[PDB]
Amino acid sequence: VYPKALRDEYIMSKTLGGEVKLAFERKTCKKVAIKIISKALNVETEIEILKKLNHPCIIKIKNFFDAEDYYIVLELMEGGELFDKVVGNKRLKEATCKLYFYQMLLAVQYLHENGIIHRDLKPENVLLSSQEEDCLIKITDFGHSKILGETSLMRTLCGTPTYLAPEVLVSVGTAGYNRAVDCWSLGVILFICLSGYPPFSEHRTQVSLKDQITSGKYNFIPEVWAEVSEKALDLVKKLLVVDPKARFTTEEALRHPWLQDEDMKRKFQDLLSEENESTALPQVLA
Amino acid sequence: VYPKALRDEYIMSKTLGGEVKLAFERKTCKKVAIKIISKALNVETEIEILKKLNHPCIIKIKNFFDAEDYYIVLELMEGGELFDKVVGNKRLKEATCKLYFYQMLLAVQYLHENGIIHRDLKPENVLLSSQEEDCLIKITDFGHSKILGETSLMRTLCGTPTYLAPEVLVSVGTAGYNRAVDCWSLGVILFICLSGYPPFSEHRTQVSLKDQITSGKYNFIPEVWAEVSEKALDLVKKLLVVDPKARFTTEEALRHPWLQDEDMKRKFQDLLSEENESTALPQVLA
Ligand SMILES: COc1ccc(CNC(=O)c2ccc3nccnc3c2)cc1
Ligand SMILES: COc1ccc(CNC(=O)c2ccc3nccnc3c2)cc1
Secondary structure: OOOHHHHHHEEEEEEOOOEEEEEEEOOOOEEEEEEEEEOOHHHHHHHHHHHHOOOOOEOOEEEEEOOOEEEEEEEOOOOEEOHHHOOOOOOOOHHHHHHHHHHHHHHHHHHHHOOEEOOOOOHHHEEEOOOOOOOOEEEOOOOOOEEOOOOHHHHHHOOOOOOOOHHHHHHHHHOOOOOHHHHHHHHHHHHHHHHOOOOOOOOOOOOOHHHHHHHOOOOOOHHHHOOOOHHHHHHHHHHOOOOOOOOOOHHHHHHOHHHOOHHHHHHHHHHHHHHHHHHOOOOOOO | OOOHHHHHHEEEEEEOOOEEEEEEEOOOOEEEEEEEEEOOHHHHHHHHHHHHOOOOOEOOEEEEEOOOEEEEEEEOOOOEEOHHHOOOOOOOOHHHHHHHHHHHHHHHHHHHHOOEEOOOOOHHHEEEOOOOOOOOEEEOOOOOOEEOOOOHHHHHHOOOOOOOOHHHHHHHHHOOOOOHHHHHHHHHHHHHHHHOOOOOOOOOOOOOHHHHHHHOOOOOOHHHHOOOOHHHHHHHHHHOOOOOOOOOOHHHHHHOHHHOOHHHHHHHHHHHHHHHHHHOOOOOOO
């Protein structure tokens, strides 16, 4: 059963999906999601990174339980996963893509600004605020996240490479572009939402999946993409770049013409206030 | 001053060189070396890896103190560093090279067998048993050592790389050859001992050091190397290989003709017994 400590604070209820169950906080009679990561190392880090992070498009941890299985109290996303909105070739409206992707770009930028590589961005980790088409999106599943700190390469470089291996000196070139893996993931999420299908698939194709990804030669159905804008596909193209040093950054994509949309940005700020206003404390007037 | 706890067990004396001082264990009136790593993370790992390791060519930790500065009680190597035997173009006899290198190859093999990449092998980390030419050698300075475990790449590979970045799939090729950095270091140690000079130096040369190492084009003075054997240089050549996948392994070098020397191997076993016999307990006879 559920630990005594979890039970004192919350009323565990129906499963929402490492399993996720809906629960109610006793103090507040408020709906919460409780993630069960069964028993282990990355859960300690996950909690640690989450406690530190603070952005509207990144999920917030409310409480945490160490027991036979780990329990993570998270704010409830009533729109569910982004995946449920893209399955079976379900294509989102272009503005609905713009609004979500923008938020993803902001979230990921913050992560990168704060030296955090998510490493596992997928529609199955993007959560929607409401059951509304226009809503706030939150990045979840920080299990695979990496922290940046002082590299063992940086420390090595301070010395004279008399005995140093060549491959290490070689590594110095490509070094410090790990984060660009999130930009590719973003590129794959954005390709999916627009088209309805994945860029690199094993469906009706003779070429290997590894080959597709390494070649950067995505499956392009123009009949499907005729529906999508010129600006939207140019961004996908700019992100789905093989050379990580040449790929777009979160900043570069944010700058891109596709995202320079005032009606979209307005909708987002208007969504932010709507959430924020409830928790708002009176401010000191001039 | 020295902590109260260190003082209770040992009598701290004269400096031997992160500083190293000679000390005397009170219980035993025995000479010991006490390494002072001033205050920090890698010291915890260093101790941890050392406690676990157990080989005649790897240094043994005797005790350890957590204070304002870290204190590591190590077995005293009365011949000092290997560096003191190679400075100012001091060249060791070929058999003296064979005997030491063999021991280095064994030590490093054990490290690799046990999933430990030393990462910082240099003459300044190779310690000699006695002030004798023929003696036992011990690998020290485990500060930069890496542990092998389950890679985050191995875990990634279990899934479908739908959203996975190309550079990661690319990395799978070169993956799991980090240890070959120790074989290069070994190659550079062996080149030094034989010749008296370093293979990749900035002395009287127009080419960059990084370039020398990346090109794998070592400084070759035949007048100096005429003195050395054909078998000895072939091993250096086999180790100083640019492609880490093509480089010699500790096993491969151990197999090499240069090391297939019975008089050398005999001398080593004879040195082992000499050390071991003092600590020897009577064995149960057949
Ligand atoms: C009224 O109760 C509900 C209404 C809508 C939903 C849809 N949401 C979900 O399915 C869901 C699943 C996992 C989650 N993990 C973390 C945060 N929020 C989550 C939300 C779930 C319950
Ligand atoms: C009688 O007293 C001595 C005789 C010879 C020496 C030469 N040895 C050393 O110089 C020395 C230095 C650092 C070390 N670090 C770890 C283990 N052993 C070490 C030995 C040092 C003292």
